[PDB]
Design a protein around this ligand. Structure first.
Ligand SMILES: CCCCCCCCCCCCCCCCCC(=O)OC[C@H](COP(=O)([O-])OCC(O)COP(=O)([O-])OC[C@@H](COC(=O)CCCCCCCCCCCCCCCCC)OC(=O)CCCCCCCCCCCCCCCCC)OC(=O)CCCCCCCCCCCCCCCCC
Ligand SMILES: CCCCCCCCCCCCCCCCCC(=O)OC[C@H](COP(=O)([O-])OCC(O)COP(=O)([O-])OC[C@@H](COC(=O)CCCCCCCCCCCCCCCCC)OC(=O)CCCCCCCCCCCCCCCCC)OC(=O)CCCCCCCCCCCCCCCCC
Ligand SMILES: CCCCCCCCCCCCCCCCCC(=O)OC[C@H](COP(=O)([O-])OCC(O)COP(=O)([O-])OC[C@@H](COC(=O)CCCCCCCCCCCCCCCCC)OC(=O)CCCCCCCCCCCCCCCCC)OC(=O)CCCCCCCCCCCCCCCCC
Ligand SMILES: CCCCCCCCCCCCCCCCCC(=O)OC[C@H](COP(=O)([O-])OCC(O)COP(=O)([O-])OC[C@@H](COC(=O)CCCCCCCCCCCCCCCCC)OC(=O)CCCCCCCCCCCCCCCCC)OC(=O)CCCCCCCCCCCCCCCCC
Ligand SMILES: CCCCCCCCCCCCCCCCCC(=O)OC[C@H](COP(=O)([O-])OCC(O)COP(=O)([O-])OC[C@@H](COC(=O)CCCCCCCCCCCCCCCCC)OC(=O)CCCCCCCCCCCCCCCCC)OC(=O)CCCCCCCCCCCCCCCCC
Ligand SMILES: CCCCCCCCCCCCCCCCCC(=O)OC[C@H](COP(=O)([O-])OCC[N+](C)(C)C)OC(=O)CCCCCCCCCCCCCCCCC
Ligand SMILES: CCCCCCCCCCCCCCCCCC(=O)OC[C@H](COP(=O)(O)OCCN)OC(=O)CCCCCCCCCCCCCCCCC
Lengths: 64, 110, 218, 113, 43, 44, 114, 88, 74, 196, 103
């Protein structure tokens, strides 16, 4: 019973992971956003609204 | 919960001031309020074309603002006395007693 | 307010608006009397004392508040036609079944209960049961149907939702009729240029999204 | 040879088939064209797992394939017309149609009943 | 023979009956929509 | 109260005589449960 | 505190004031909504005529003249102003008062540069 | 519940305005709040999402939206100055 | 007639348990815990509320079929 | 085995405690009539009657762990189990007799409603064949029970006094014509004389 | 009644009786009914109570059986009063929080 429940959980996780992959692929398919100057110095990314920018292509300038 | 939520948070002092000013206005400028209600009761004047009631609403709001802005020194004194008594009544968590009807009547008769 | 029953709207130019205003004015007196009665009852119950009143005024007089809200919205709407009910059938298939139980539109007979009673009557006739027994078995399903039919304040809630929807729809329709002549000229070129029947707001939102996604920031 | 046992087995098979149909419908909605990648995986363990857990679906598909083959043969015999769409051999046709499970993509037993 | 808290039991039964009747009949919470026509008006 | 009501119904109505004391007790238990539920819910 | 008559008078007066504020809101919203509908319709017509976008069925597609679209110009200028004047707005994890001060300073800068 | 507590539910839906402001000034403020500009389509997108992080009361909502509208109006004026062609 | 009204408890339900009095304190504790939980949830839901009315509070309507809700001017 | 220990302790305690009361419970059941043999337990005082009814099944079914039992303790538990089984059989017999009594009372009630003064809608002058046959078969079964209860004079006397009362009432409720002699042939032998 | 209807009625009543008997005497159903009956008896005749017949001498009666009513009253009253005080405190906290947040 334990391993059957684990297998069912694994199948559910597989479905959830593929749905996440599909949505992330759709998000990445969008054109890249170029952040320069003031935007580059102050990136829009924030923990408050990170989901809006998650898995989105951004061209940013900075000093590594 | 079934009670409606609050939109604007009024301090106790602000709530008492607005309540007293509203009571005073309901006597001072009742005609404008009645005209505004009459113009806003109709479907055309309420939903379809509310702009026709704009002038009457402006007049009523001007009258209410005049009431709120106590110009006379006697009016200011009476309002201050009534507001202080109301503050004491509200802050009195112990068993409540006498009312502020006398002070309200003086402010309305000012 | 004692509004007059003669609508001041021009029927030749704003037919639906004039009809709505006429119906609203016609029913306003009755609905205002009902609203005044309800408000008086509420305020007196509040003025009551201890358990007879204030101690449990807001929380236990809920049916009165619901009736007051229903009366206010129905007064604002004036009258309801089957076309709007069919329109709202999209979101509420049982809209008619709820509006009939909410408002005193038509007399409702317990048809299902009477049919069950007739079936029990046939059973009793077949098995030679007393006429008193079969009459009781006819009354019982009718009573059950009536009990399950009347009341049902969920129907009143859904009627309130439908009335809000209908009021918004009527306001939008009135604006459409008011601005039809102004938008006539622009409408022809829009029909001759755009072959889609979708809403301008939806198309503009989609265009804004497309610009935000594809247009270069530069 | 008990009617009660037969009915219980039939009910259990119905429930199992319905669950398999729901699972397959979800997996197909998620893998419109990639479902075969997991259903017919070359791994023996995965193949056995799929066959065991979708046995009602596979037996139903086998019965449907046999019935369709016989019906097509009857039509050809009666009408002197064409072949079974193509000239596929019996073994190839039956194996292909039994392995193919897309026929259940939009089918739910409870909804149909 | 002695009954523990017999007076408490009597009062609890009386209170239960009173509350049940109160909620069932709504005797204290009457309706005055019928009295509205027979009442004066202010303002 | 409930006992008195049941007694009056049994002594006056001939048809009510069919019910057993067991059935009367079952009705009593259901009525007590419903009354308790009513008292609890009215305050919720 | 006060007599019930005075309380009901105050309730009626407050209802009237709320209705007046609603009247103001309705008037302004209706006017600006008519203006918005006219502007959006005209923008869509101009785009379709110039070929910036192709509107078929229930979808809008990028045309060959997309770069000249007035909506594109508006978006570019909005980005330009958000960069030059209202910098740091996208990521400003400050207090409410600090946010208000930042908005006020941005408004003052825009007014000065306008 | 006493009238002293009930009246709070009728005092709450009234927006607070300075007692020295005229009805015309209040209506002008409402008009400015409801003003419409073409550039609003994108500035609103970039403003409201941020404002969702700070709005917890109607007063905060009003202040933030009014400031956004003022900024949008200034931006619209500047854009009209920059691109006279689209507005002739 | 015979007088029968009385507030006294019936001896049928007055029996005690073998270990002492009936299980009163335990059930009172359980009821107090349940009431605490219920009233805490109700208070938390009731008091921490506000009504925000702005454009972001409105979303596009749709039918039960998922399509956008639009009604013609028939 | 802590769980086994707890199970055995519970079973022993309940079984022995209720075996010590089965005698009183059965005596009260015998004392009460067949219309509601549990009337005393339902109305006046439930002297572990429901407890006996519940735990009889447990004694019959639930297993035992002798290693957790002593010698005299095991013997006492077996005696209590046998007593509970006897109580179950007695309850089954009482239920059967009570149901037969209620069958006869149903016949009597059907007759009574026919002659009720309030019966202004279903007044029938002549008794019908269905109820006549029901009465005949019920009387035949009652006579068979009386014959089968020959070895228990007290049980036979109670069965007569309780069940045959309604048979005598049915006898009195109809005139002595038509099929009456054939219907009450068996009753008239002894039972009619007793109810005079 | 008509003899044909009598046959039908006899068959119907026999079917009803057989169905009821089977459902009541079926193994799992019988066990469920038995356990549910004992549970209902326990719930109805052994519910928590404050008044009971005292058949023990004051020397053989526990102090719990003498102060249970007082303990229960104290618990209930304290719970109600504490809930009222918590409601007041939550009201004050929410008022202060939103006031300091704005206006
Ligand atoms: C499948 C199974 C079978 C199904 C069958 C079908 C039917 C359903 C059956 C199910 C079983 C449950 C049925 C309910 C029980 C019925 C009992 C009964 O009939 O007894 C009759 C029998 C009647 O006998 P009687 O001779 O008439 O005597 C009654 C008189 O009233 C004599 O009464 P009394 O005197 O003994 O009084 C009772 C005593 C009882 O009290 C208690 O001990 C109880 C306390 C409450 C505890 C609550 C515990 C709840 C726990 C819940 C946990 C969560 C559950 C979640 C479930 C999830 C599912 C798994 O009360 C008190 O002690 C009074 C307290 C008063 C407090 C006063 C406060 C004053 C404050 C001020 C302080 C001082 C300030 C001074 C200031 C000075 C300023 C100057 O009653 C009793 O003898 C017992 C007392 C009555 C108890 C009532 C209990 C009702 C419970 C209802 C529960 C409903 C739940 C539904 C859940 C739904 C979920 C979906
Ligand atoms: C609007 C909201 C909805 C309202 C409706 C709600 C209904 C809910 C479901 C009701 C289910 C009831 C049936 C189950 C209960 C047990 C019945 C039973 O034992 O079955 C066998 C028993 C039949 O036994 P049987 O062997 O055939 O009869 C011979 C035995 O000796 C008989 O021995 P017994 O002593 O056992 O039999 C007595 C039997 C009573 O049976 C009888 O013996 C005779 C029944 C008819 C009596 C008719 C009146 C006779 C003359 C009296 C004087 C009146 C003068 C009026 C003029 C005055 C002018 C100043 O008593 C009962 O039925 C007990 C329960 C009665 C109350 C519940 C039913 C109320 C129904 C009310 C509506 C009736 C339909 C509309 C009528 C109006 C149309 C314009 O009952 C039935 O099968 C018949 C059931 C009753 C049928 C309706 C008869 C009319 C009753 C009117 C009562 C008025 C009360 C005032 C308040 C009304 C407010 C709405
Ligand atoms: C709380 C949330 C969760 C609830 C879960 C409920 C689950 C119920 C499932 C029932 C399954 C069938 C049971 C068959 C019987 C098997 C047990 C047995 O034979 O009894 C052995 C044992 C002793 O029996 P006995 O040896 O035959 O004793 C009686 C003889 O007279 C000999 O007597 P004695 O003089 O020798 O003395 C022995 C004394 C021995 O007593 C004890 O030893 C028990 C004392 C109490 C508990 C003590 C321990 C406390 C701590 C427990 C910790 C557990 C932690 C669990 C951890 C789990 C983690 C996974 O016996 C008693 O006094 C019996 C007490 C009966 C209490 C009845 C309560 C009825 C009222 C309930 C509702 C209250 C609501 C009030 C609301 C008012 C608001 C204003 O009895 C019990 O276990 C008592 C069980 C009573 C409750 C069962 C019914 C509950 C139903 C609640 C209402 C639900 C309605 C919902 C809607 C309906 C559809 C869902
Ligand atoms: C949605 C909400 C739902 C919840 C709320 C509900 C509210 C409404 C009331 C509901 C009432 C109706 C309930 C449905 C009827 C149930 C009928 C049933 O069980 O059928 C079996 C019954 C078969 O058994 P049987 O024929 O009577 O027995 C012979 C068999 O050969 C078996 O032979 P065996 O010897 O191998 O097996 C005997 C025993 C398995 O034997 C064992 O392995 C040992 C079991 C424990 C024995 C007792 C030891 C107690 C130790 C002290 C504990 C103290 C705790 C702390 C408190 C201390 C202070 C007081 O197996 C059973 O038959 C178990 C019956 C149920 C439990 C009986 C024990 C009651 C007392 C213990 C629990 C209550 C606490 C009392 C605390 C106070 C005590 C003084 O019939 C069926 O097979 C029917 C099956 C189909 C129906 C559904 C089945 C559901 C199964 C549920 C099992 C639950 C287990 C307990 C869970 C506890 C979790 C915390
Ligand atoms: C149509 C469906 C109705 C379903 C009813 C509910 C399910 C059955 C009851 C389960 C236990 C409930 C809790 C205990 C309550 C107290 C029980 C009691 O004292 O009743 C006896 C007492 C004595 O009367 P009697 O006429 O001499 O006995 C019945 C006749 O023998 C025979 O006459 P009869 O008319 O009763 O014949 C049966 C006829 C039925 O006739 C009808 O059409 C009945 C019409 C009245 C319906 C009443 C509805 C009451 C709803 C509440 C029930 C309580 C539980 C639910 C609580 C939450 C509710 C929200 O058709 C059936 O067989 C019905 C289906 C039976 C399947 C039962 C499946 C196992 C039990 C499942 C539920 C257990 C609770 C689980 C909780 C959750 C666990 C996780 O009977 C009554 O109370 C009369 C009313 C009938 C009550 C239901 C049936 C009881 C059967 C008990 C038989 C015991 C053996 C007989 C002696 C043998 C000695 C050797
Ligand atoms: C919405 C519907 C409303 C309908 C309203 C109907 C009202 C019905 C009121 C009924 C009152 C009670 C009598 C019927 C029920 C009796 C039940 C019962 O238990 O009784 C059983 C007993 C009868 O049975 P029994 O006496 O044989 O007792 C049973 C005995 N064993 C068990 C042995 C069989 O009592 C009666 O039925 C008594 C009936 C008396 C009838 C009196 C009639 C008076 C008529 C007056 C007319 C006045 C006209 C004036 C005109 C003036 C013009 C100017
Ligand atoms: C032909 C037509 C035929 C028609 C037939 C119709 C038959 C219908 C039969 C059923 C309906 C009967 C209705 C009777 C009237 C209502 C009576 C009532 O409410 O009480 C019921 C019962 C107590 O009354 P009763 O049992 O009847 O009399 C006992 C006398 N010692 O109460 C109970 O037992 C209920 C359980 C609770 C009892 C009270 C408990 C104490 C009260 C305080 C509880 C505190 C809880 C915790 C604290 C809360 C507050 C802080």
């Amino acid at each position: 019973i334990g391993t059957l429940l684990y297998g069912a959980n694994q199948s559910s996780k597989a479905r959830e992971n593929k749905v996440a992959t599909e949505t992330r692929k759709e998000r990445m398919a969008k054109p890249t956003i170029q952040l320069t100057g003031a935007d580059s110095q102050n990136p829009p990314f924030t923990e408050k609204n990170i989901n809006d920018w998650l898995y989105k292509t951004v061209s940013i300038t900075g000093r590594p | 919960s079934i009670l409606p939520p609050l939109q604007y948070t009024y301090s106790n002092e602000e709530s008492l001031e607005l309540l007293i000013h509203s009571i005073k206005g309901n006597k001072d400028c009742n005609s404008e309020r009645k005209a505004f209600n009459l113009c806003r009761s109709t479907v055309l004047g309420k939903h379809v074309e509310p702009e026709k009631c704009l002038d009457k609403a402006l007049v009523f709001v001007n009258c209410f603002q005049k009431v709120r802005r106590d110009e006379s020194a006697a009016c200011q004194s009476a309002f201050n006395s009534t507001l202080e008594c109301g503050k004491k009544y509200s802050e009195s968590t112990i068993s409540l007693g006498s009312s502020c009807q006398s002070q309200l009547d003086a402010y309305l008769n000012c | 307010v004692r509004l007059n029953l003669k609508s001041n709207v021009d029927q030749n130019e704003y037919p639906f608006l004039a009809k709505w205003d006429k119906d609203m004015r016609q029913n306003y007196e009755e609905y205002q009397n009902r609203i005044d009665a309800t408000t008086y009852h509420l305020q007196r119950s509040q003025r009551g004392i201890a358990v007879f009143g204030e101690w449990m005024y807001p929380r236990y007089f809920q049916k009165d508040i619901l009736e007051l809200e229903v009366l206010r919205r129905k007064q604002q709407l004036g009258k309801i036609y089957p076309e709007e009910v069919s329109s709202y059938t999209q979101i509420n298939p049982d809209i008619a079944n709820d509006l009939n139980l909410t408002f005193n539109a038509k007399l409702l007979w317990p048809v299902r209960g009477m049919t069950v009673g007739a079936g029990f009557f046939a059973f009793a006739h077949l098995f030679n049961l007393p006429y008193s027994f079969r009459l009781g078995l006819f009354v019982l399903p009718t009573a059950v149907e009536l009990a399950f039919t009347w009341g049902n304040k969920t129907s009143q809630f859904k009627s309130i939702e439908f009335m809000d929807y209908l009021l918004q729809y009527r306001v939008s329709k009135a604006l459409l009729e008011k601005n039809a002549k102004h938008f006539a000229e622009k409408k022809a070129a829009y029909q001759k240029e755009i072959n889609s029947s979708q809403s301008v707001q939806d198309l503009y939102n989609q265009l804004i999204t497309l610009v935000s996604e594809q247009a270069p920031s530069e | 040879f008990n009617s009660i046992l037969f009915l219980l087995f039939f009910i259990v098979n119905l429930y199992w088939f319905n669950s398999g149909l729901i699972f397959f419908n979800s997996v197909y909605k998620i893998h419109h064209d990639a479902w075969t990648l997991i259903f017919q995986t070359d791994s023996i363990l995965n193949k056995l797992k799929i066959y065991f857990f979708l046995l009602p679906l596979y037996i139903s598909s086998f019965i449907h394939s046999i019935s369709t083959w016989y019906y097509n043969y009857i039509l050809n015999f009666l009408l002197f017309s064409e072949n079974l769409n193509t000239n596929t051999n019996f073994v190839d046709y039956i194996t292909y149609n039994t392995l193919l499970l897309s026929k259940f993509e939009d089918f739910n037993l409870f909804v149909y009943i | 023979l002695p009954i523990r808290n017999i007076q408490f039991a009597r009062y609890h039964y009386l209170a239960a009956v009173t509350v049940f009747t109160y909620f069932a009949t709504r005797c204290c919470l009457l309706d005055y929509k019928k009295y509205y026509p027979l009442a004066s008006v202010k303002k | 109260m409930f006992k008195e009501l049941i007694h009056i119904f049994r002594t006056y109505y001939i048809t009510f005589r069919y019910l057993k004391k067991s059935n009367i007790n079952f009705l009593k238990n259901l009525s007590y449960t419903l009354i308790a539920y009513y008292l609890i819910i009215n305050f919720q | 505190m006060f007599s019930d008559f005075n309380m009901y008078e105050a309730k009626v007066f407050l209802k009237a004031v709320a209705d007046a504020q609603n009247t103001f809101r309705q008037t302004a919203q209706q006017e600006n909504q008519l203006a918005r509908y006219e502007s959006q319709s005209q923008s869509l017509l101009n785009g379709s005529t110039s070929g910036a976008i192709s509107i078929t069925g229930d979808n809008i597609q990028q045309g060959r003249n997309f770069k000249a679209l007035k909506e594109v110009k508006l978006f570019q200028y909005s980005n330009e102003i958000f960069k030059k004047y209202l910098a740091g707005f996208d990521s400003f994890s400050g207090d409410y008062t600090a946010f208000k001060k930042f908005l006020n300073e941005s408004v003052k800068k825009i007014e000065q540069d306008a | 519940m006493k009238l002293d507590q009930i009246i709070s539910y009728y005092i709450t839906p009234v927006r607070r305005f300075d007692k020295n402001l005229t009805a015309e000034q209040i209506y002008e403020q409402y008009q400015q709040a409801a003003q419409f500009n073409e550039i609003d389509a994108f500035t609103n997108i970039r403003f409201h999402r941020k404002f969702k992080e700070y709005i917890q009361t109607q007063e905060q909502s009003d202040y933030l939206y009014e400031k956004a509208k003022q900024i949008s109006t200034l931006a619209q004026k500047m854009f009209e100055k920059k691109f006279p062609e689209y507005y002739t | 007639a015979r007088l029968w009204w009385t507030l006294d408890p019936s001896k049928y339900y007055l029996k005690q348990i073998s270990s002492g009095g009936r299980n009163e304190i335990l059930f009172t504790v359980l009821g107090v815990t349940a009431a605490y939980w219920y009233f805490g949830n109700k208070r938390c839901e009731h008091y921490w509320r506000r009504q925000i009315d702005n454009c972001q509070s409105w979303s596009r309507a749709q039918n039960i079929n998922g399509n956008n809700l639009t009604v013609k001017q028939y | 085995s802590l769980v086994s220990l707890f199970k055995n302790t519970f079973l022993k305690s309940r079984v022995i405690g209720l075996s010590f009361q089965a005698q009183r419970v059965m005596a009260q059941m015998a004392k009460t009539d067949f219309e509601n043999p549990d009337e005393h337990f339902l109305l006046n005082d439930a002297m572990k009657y429901n407890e006996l009814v519940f735990y009889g099944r447990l004694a019959e079914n639930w297993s035992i762990n002798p290693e957790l039992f002593g010698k005299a303790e095991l013997a006492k538990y077996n005696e209590a189990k046998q007593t509970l089984i006897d109580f179950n059989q007695y309850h089954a017999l009482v239920q059967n007799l009570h149901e037969f009594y209620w069958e006869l009372k149903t016949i009597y009630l059907e007759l009574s409603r026919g002659v009720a003064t309030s019966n202004f809608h279903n007044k029938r002058e002549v008794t019908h064949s269905i109820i006549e046959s029901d009465i005949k078969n019920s009387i035949h079964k009652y006579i068979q029970l009386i014959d089968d209860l020959k070895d228990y004079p007290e049980w036979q006397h109670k069965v007569r006094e309780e069940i045959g009362y309604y048979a005598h009432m049915i006898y009195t409720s109809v005139n002595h014509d038509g099929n009456f002699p054939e219907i009450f042939k068996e009753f008239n032998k002894v039972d009619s004389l007793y109810y005079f | 009644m008509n003899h044909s209807c009598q046959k039908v009625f006899e068959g119907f009543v026999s079917a009803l009786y057989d169905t009821s008997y089977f459902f009541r005497n079926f193994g799992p159903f019988k066990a469920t009914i038995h356990y549910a009956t004992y549970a209902n008896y326990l719930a109805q005749n052994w519910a928590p109570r404050v008044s009971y017949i005292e058949t023990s001498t004051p020397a053989y009666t526990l102090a719990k059986n003498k102060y249970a009513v007082y303990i229960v009253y104290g618990l209930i009253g304290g719970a109600l009063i504490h809930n009222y005080m918590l409601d007041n405190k939550a009201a004050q906290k929410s008022q202060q929080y939103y006031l300091k947040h704005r206006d």
